[model samples]
Target: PPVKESSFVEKMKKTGRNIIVFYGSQTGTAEEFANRLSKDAHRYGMRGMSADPEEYDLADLSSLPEIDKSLVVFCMATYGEGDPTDNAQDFYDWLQETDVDLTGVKFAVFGLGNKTYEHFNAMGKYVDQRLEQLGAQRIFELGLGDDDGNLEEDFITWREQFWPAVCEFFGVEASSIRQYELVVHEDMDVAKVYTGEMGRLKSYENQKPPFDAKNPFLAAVTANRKLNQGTERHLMHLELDISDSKIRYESGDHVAVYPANDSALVNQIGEILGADLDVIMSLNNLDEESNKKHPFPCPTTYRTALTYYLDITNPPRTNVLYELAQYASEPSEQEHLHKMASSSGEGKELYLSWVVEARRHILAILQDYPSLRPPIDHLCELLPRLQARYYSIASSSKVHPNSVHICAVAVEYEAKSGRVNKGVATSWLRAKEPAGRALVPMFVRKSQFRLPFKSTTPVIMVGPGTGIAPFMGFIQERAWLREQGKEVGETLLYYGCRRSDEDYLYREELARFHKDGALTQLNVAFSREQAHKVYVQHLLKRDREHLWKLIHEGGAHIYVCGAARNMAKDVQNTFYDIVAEFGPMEHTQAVDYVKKLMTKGRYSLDVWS
Candidate 1:
């Protein structure tokens, strides 16, 4: 393997490509970005291929061929807290540790991360640094895509320079980009379709235990109940029976539930597209020689594709809207679309107000711009693959051996226009009837969030709202260990919600843990029950002295969960204050001290945007 071309090189050779776009995707963003880059690269007179990190041989990266002439695009997504994605972890470790001579390799990087995270884009930044340090040539500056703000616009802006960079490196003319045509074929005969029956045939087809993201085990719902009372908020405690599958999880593991698109929303899209729900369609890449490809599996129907595979909930990309404008007969519609999609225009602000603020999706956009009726293939080509939503596992596998539990706060909100918005997975789960055991496809995702090695270790967990989900597992695991007559940790939890009677989750169970000495302390902050709004941060502030003692004297670890925006940041600030006042250190020292804890794995955070 030292001298011969690598698997990536062989793939490139077979495809007759000069560029390979590799993606370290956790969700679907980076993968989509890589595909988009590949799509555009073909337009500029070069063949491009998008690859997953796991698919390529990174161990022998030094043996890669055509390094001087070919270009490599890295669309790296930094998972929570500077970590590499599951697929990229091995490659990342190999790249960081193994010595590889990439003296001739040319590369460009794009990082996808939320800025709310402290280690935002750390994975991308580190990978870029390692490649450069190992003698690779930097073809372009490291580009960052922020999930919290504007990603599509930022990616498009960065790709502007990408074409020029490719031209500069390949010594070829890159002006006047050639675009592909959309070709879709409508079929009369449609086979069996979605409605949860899609996987029934596979059950008898396979004998071995089959469980993965692609072929998820249909875990039966064992227990489902509303945790909240007075508030309209529906916090559901769901227990899934996973006894039939080989899937197993630890106390700190997460569960990724594959969600189907809302039936109403799916129907709305189908209606707008003038599509027959049963009509299967084949999407073809116009150029047989080109590497540009459809995002999802082809020969799929408009309805099944829309319902299961494609994502219509996200805001439509400006480029996609520009393409939709091409199909519009009305010149005014074309003009308006071009203006928004143009590079020098105020598309971001318009997107914020019209789409973001209005809480609208591609369907809403189609309705708003009536003249833009795109083809079925065009919609399939543009729409992203529906993402699997992950939730922190709320039950210890040791305790509930055959079942996995999840605490989901059903996401429902009205827009400024009074249009209701629902979270796809949460709503799908909430609507699932408890009478019959509804089977939902699910898989276990390993989490970095975990208890310390020694059971005698002390822990301080601050999880507000539904963020309290993971701590329940931690508490349960600790309780189980104590029941086994093993030495257990001193666990402290600071949980908050609206009111004790209304939205307090796992109230009875938490009481039992406290009664049994499994819970060292359980601090509750009911914001609405008090005269003034009190949160977990207030409770943390109140117990700063005790927390400081636990951290300094008893060597306690800190864990934080919940929303990344306010609560995670606020908790960090509280820690900073506690360190400054308690440790009597300088402000910068406090920051460094907190950062040190994070690096040491004494402090961990499981947060989402």
Candidate 2:
């Protein structure tokens, strides 16, 4: 297939666009933000487009200043360890190494990162400094959005000030801009319509090898069982049959499973919008030369769009509120929506309380505002695409070569509005039964978390709750090695849960491994079992001397997997303390020792918020 133009500046000129937003995204968040910014630019009297840095050649980046009132926006996200995102790596390298003069170029940067990460917004910081260092003028301060808390709000806060800065620079005024025109195809052939297929049409029907995030294989569910005995919550153990597919996953790799929205919720939104759920329609961008043909795969029916494409469960973004306000017929409701969509003052507070704090989703908001009935096509275009949920593979490929296992806890909670909220993927997975041969669209993602090359490398793992998933695979692989008469080293695990009798996951398997010599030592921390709380870090402290021996004398590799907010930090600190106390070194020296361990790949972490 012939490729489209690779120069973004040329593409911008062809499309008659003055602004281009580039994104270096891993999980699509940065891309979404870039698209939002591009759309927002229309309100500032500028035609803008969003692009992936990988798809465009940056050789023409220095020529952006040639266009009148041209502006470049970089919505860069910092990946693991301050590194640039996969798609942005080439661009980052070129920018860092190139000495091309960028005089007269005006640019802005927004970085997405987690504050809990050691190198928060590192890529953003570097790019911003590099651009200015190369003689480009900074039109606005760099915006850093923290994923640890209120990322959406942080973006809104930055964007409010950003638009005004753009207006001042370009001598333009803010006004409403219509971007899309909804076209309902009444006579289109039914067979050509997209019915939940991902990238290519009929992809699911005519499946192929090399399954990936873009085109996932529909794996059959072979086993589904509850691993917990609690009424308040549930931990599910699931196995998928990958026998017919070419997908091969290591023990510590991740599995991304696509989930559909609940049918009930989808129907509720359709009814509220007063739209035909089966009607075929598409939202065509007003700019004919723009590359975006449709908002999502189409000519999809409204039912498919709601159920399989858009995100309707999460809190609607402020931009969505702003759009809905334009369609509200009642004056009071329109004013209220506008207020909530505002960036500051009472509006921000109201949005935080009514939407964010209450966990009010799009469906809930529509139900509450009786006078607001936006067009189904417009609403579909506004909503974000549904993303796949990732989980640690809980089985070893050597043990179960034809199948994959995942351990997940179903998420369900009552919102402040007295309505219950359920996780999109977890709740969907919870309803599946083994007999149905449920087909889950899934793909494997490779990970750095892995066992050492040598079997004699002593291993220590601290995983609590569902975080024990990858460790299960580790234990199983080691057990299989031992059965093969291969010499294995000391394997220790620090596991924690709320209660031993209620929510302890894989209790029998862990006990069996320990009894069979596959697991040399198993330290369990049941937080609610005693009067006071005790966690995996506490157990690590209790056995600090043994840990020191394993690390110093035996050359053990340490792994910390679990919640990043507290457990991973606590365990890391405890390891440093143990090293200082046992090695008789200064605290800083011990810290440096652990840093060296990390650098050497002996200390690894697979944590999440």
Candidate 3:
């Protein structure tokens, strides 16, 4: 609908005063901020609303709103390096094609992130750059909120400066900015509160997670599909039923499944920290001058807070070393904190990156010193919220209606320290059980990893391990299309795994898709399958002739989805090599060719670690 035209765009075109706020969020922080900003604009007596850009298009943007008039803001967060949240994938990708200039449209950015991440606020930076390029004018300096800190407060600070300037430009009175306090958009449902009856903590419906960053799921945990076979790793095909719900999605759409911390993990955190679970923890505001928001604003039991809100498994940040050190329960414990955070010496980066998990660093300090348990005012303020993880949808809706699927491999391994590190969401998903064999909380995230409208647009996929999940859907869809006598292009798949026999997940299903004539060819590599460790890149090299022909001759759309660890990067480099050394182009020219391909939307990569 966005490609052609839509009523929403038409209405916005007419009004010219509408503020279109798109929230690029994976874990709900950006969404909440977007909603808040939209409400703030609406409070000022303007027609403001939240728009999911995946449902809309760039052409719609170009036509409906003028650069100088419309208020466009991207409330987004960076995930895994410089990438935008999965929900923002389509809009982000589309903007890549229209990457000229926007030097006129009024735009601002609010980034939700933690400095612990190497690519802190990179997504917001990209959006700001893109907006400037698309002939849009930037209204405010990009705002970066550290989620590891009181990111909420950072957002408030940005808003404090932003609204004044905006209203001033629009010739509106300052009174219009604060006619009302920003209200949250949720109502209580007392009936939905139910936990195990025995030894229940509280029956108060008021015990619900506070009005903060939250992705409300009007949906429930429905059907699940297991894609992995093992006890060691919980690689799964999580099937969530969106049946009879308002959410609708296409074949390549991804859903950000807002996950809750496992109740078991909640209990263990308190024990490990040597803190009483039932103790009502009171917190002090970390910053009174610059940052006004309390790091931990509300008072609640440690268990209550962990169970209801906050991402418990977030990685340790550099500043936390000094922050937590301030309130170390004992003098001896302070030494351990210092060891992890020696200033001007350079163990800080190692400490933060090496530890990986924030909980691990705290636990390490506690174990080594044993007397560092801090007070409620200190400990409560230091810990970060448990973060949510997102995964690509593994199955197609047209193929499976009552179920939505996610392909995830449990990232668990024995470190040199003998501690087992596991992925947050995969482990959480593995631990969860069906609520009477159906019901799953799921919200589909729009994926740029889509097939060409012409079924005959030859497709080449490079997916290793769980990355092959979406390709399976692609093949299934292709087979059905071919069967209906629609012109279907040749389909090529390159998949890699541990061993063909041992860990080839959904092997039977893939074979079915191929034999059914959905797939034209399949090339496989097992990094550990052969002598010198051959991976997906090696497979690409071996089949370069065909792949090149498909790309240059057949005009195939290349889709890569899988391990972001190294497979995708290695394979991409290999493609450039083939194009350089063998194809009708020089090395740099071939690299530029691939860049052009990506910029033109012929090449798409969807890899995540």
Model 3: residues with Cα > 4 Å off, grouped in runs: 1-215, 218-232, 262-264, 272-276, 279-301, 338-343, 346-354, 357-361, 376-378, 435-439
lDDT (C-alpha, whole model) for all candidates: 0.79, 0.89, 0.64
**What would the per-residue lDDT of candidate 2 be over residues 1-609, giving only the tens digit for each residue?**
124366788777877889999998987789888998998877678988999888776757799987889999999999767889988888898887899988989999999999987679999999899989898999999999998888888898898899999999889998455567888889997788998878898887788987888899988889999999886688999999899798898988999988999999998888888888988888788878777778788887989988888888989888779878988899999988888867789988989889999999998888888899998878887888898889999999999989999999999999986699999999999988888468888999988889988999999999999999999999999999999999999999999999988899999999999999999999999999999999999999999999999999999999888767677888889999999999999999999999899889899888887
Total colliding residue pairs, candidate 2: 0
Candidates 1 and 2 compared by lDDT, better number? 2
Q: Rank the candidates by lDDT, best first.
A: 2, 1, 3
- Measured by TM-score, the strongest candidate is 2
Q: Which candidate ranks first by lDDT, i.e. highest?
A: 2
Listed in order, each prediction's TM-score against the native is: 0.91, 0.96, 0.66
Q: Give per-residue CA lDDT, model 1, range 308-336, as digits (tens).
A: 77777776667666667776778887777
Looking at model 3, which ten-residue stretch has the lowest summed lDDT? 176-185
State the lDDT of candidate 3 residue by residue for 505-565, as single tens digits: 7888878877877778777776775678877788788888878888888888998887543
Candidate 1 residues lying further than 4 Å off, grouped into runs, are 1-6, 58-69, 175-210, 284-294, 297-299, 416-418
- lDDT, residue 279, candidate 2: 89
